[PDB]
């Protein structure tokens, strides 16, 4: 009788002319993994419920899947899913795709260092950067990627000779700071 | 029959095309004070000397409140000075005209910085800026208000980051230094 | 029936219009001063060797020198060199041509602070500079003769309020880490 919580299924489709309603792939299969291994439901409804999050090519696929074998479990789907979708970079292709990304013409600079942010993780689970430098390559990334203003410029080069270096915490800090 | 010196009486006329000669009225008030209190001579001879600093329109007030009442004290002409005169300022106007005062366009920021520190004892006297926060404040207002860049906006955000904040004295050093 | 190892004459001429191939007088004395004092031969070998490093205007004051005196000790031919080549530099004038030192038009700052320690050492040498203030004249010399701006005009500021001052291999390593 009362209100409702309603909450939005994370909808998935492959395309490359995404929507905006529409997750990278690696979102999507954090849930679709729970719906398979996590919720109780038998099998015949995992299906219906993984099928319901999915549009447009990557729907297809779930088709192409199931209609070449019906015996197949929701797993070897998402077993599927991954060799389709899922990034299939190496350690060469990570440092150079986080080496290459600058800030775009658009970015206000702490959208550019939190975006960059991103692929270090990306690359330090591919074992392409230690974990032990990844600081290091923060702030030379930041400064060779960043459009930098002269005063923040200073504060960033002070802090690359400073002895311990910034967290990434730290280090938005003091760009969001210089933002205005 | 050697050399004498007369230290130069302060004279005030209240005009707004003040002479180059003129005090502000808060500095005629602490000479006139003076005269009234201090000084050993009977009401008579302080009412000349108080009488003998003014000119102007200050004068024609001194001329108004006598001649309306004969019998006044120098005390009390000096109540209505203060009431015609002495500044009628708000905590909120107070802060207001500090926030607004802004580096003039034929200012050196050294002077600015001078000026401005005036200011916020005036705004702090009216209890309208806590004392405890002053140098925060110096240090905003500064290079919120000033024509800085670079290298002096470096050393300033450093010393707002540097943990204990300058005293107006180490502000004006700092900003003397980058006036060459 | 080996390989050999020679290793260049240090050849000077003492021509203003000095050949790529030719040094400073101070630099061919050094060499002079071992042919004169510390190899073992004769003065008649000695004269021979110390003759074959000059050519130009140079070796014509050795044949002029030799001519008006053939007794002469290659000791007293170096003192001849001296009096005609070695610089007549004083407190006033070493003082000058250091401060009056800034960065050529063509010049890498980093070459330019290197080449301005010669002068301070030569300065130095007449006693024109005291060594305790040495650090200080670097510091100021580089910041008012280089041309510089922005990060390493920030760097450089803050050094000279950092206390202790560099090293000339420090003023270096700051310069250089600036050069890219």
Same mark, same amino acid.
């Given at each position: 009788?009362?209100?409702?919580?309603?909450?939005?299924?994370?909808?998935? $489709?492959? $395309?490359?002319?995404? *929507?905006?309603?529409?997750?990278?792939?690696?979102?999507?299969?954090?849930? *679709?993994? =729970?719906?398979?291994?996590? &919720?109780?439901?038998?099998? *015949?409804?995992?299906? #219906? &419920?993984?099928? =319901?999050?999915?549009?447009?090519? *990557?729907?297809?696929?779930?088709?192409?899947?199931?209609?070449?074998?019906?015996?197949?479990?929701?797993?070897?789907?998402? =077993?599927?899913?991954?060799?389709?979708?899922?990034?299939?970079? $190496?350690?060469?292709? $990570?440092?150079?795709?986080?080496?290459?990304?600058?800030?775009?013409?658009?970015?206000?600079?702490?959208?550019?260092?939190?975006?960059?942010?991103?692929?270090?993780?990306?690359?330090?689970?591919?074992?392409?950067?230690?974990?032990?430098?990844?600081?290091?390559?923060?702030?030379?990334?930041?400064?060779?990627?960043?459009?930098?203003?002269?005063?923040? &410029?200073? #504060?960033?080069? =002070?802090?690359?000779?400073?002895?311990?270096?910034?967290?990434?915490?730290?280090?938005?800090?003091?760009?969001?700071?210089?933002?205005?």
């Amino acid at each position: 009788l009362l209100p409702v919580k309603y909450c939005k299924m994370r909808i998935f $489709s492959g $395309s490359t002319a995404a *929507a905006p309603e529409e997750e990278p792939f690696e979102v999507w299969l954090e849930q *679709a993994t =729970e719906i398979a291994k996590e &919720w109780p439901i038998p099998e *015949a409804e995992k299906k #219906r &419920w993984v099928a =319901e999050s999915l549009r447009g090519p *990557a729907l297809d696929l779930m088709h192409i899947v199931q209609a070449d074998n019906p015996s197949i479990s929701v797993g070897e789907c998402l =077993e599927a899913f991954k060799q389709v979708f899922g990034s299939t970079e $190496s350690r060469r292709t $990570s440092q150079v795709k986080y080496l290459r990304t600058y800030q775009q013409e658009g970015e206000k600079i702490s959208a550019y260092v939190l975006r960059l942010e991103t692929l270090l993780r990306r690359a330090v689970e591919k074992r392409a950067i230690p974990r032990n430098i990844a600081d290091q390559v923060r702030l030379e990334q930041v400064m060779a990627g960043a459009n930098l203003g002269n005063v923040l &410029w200073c #504060r960033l080069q =002070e802090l690359k000779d400073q002895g311990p270096l910034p967290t990434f915490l730290q280090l938005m800090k003091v760009i969001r700071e210089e933002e205005e």
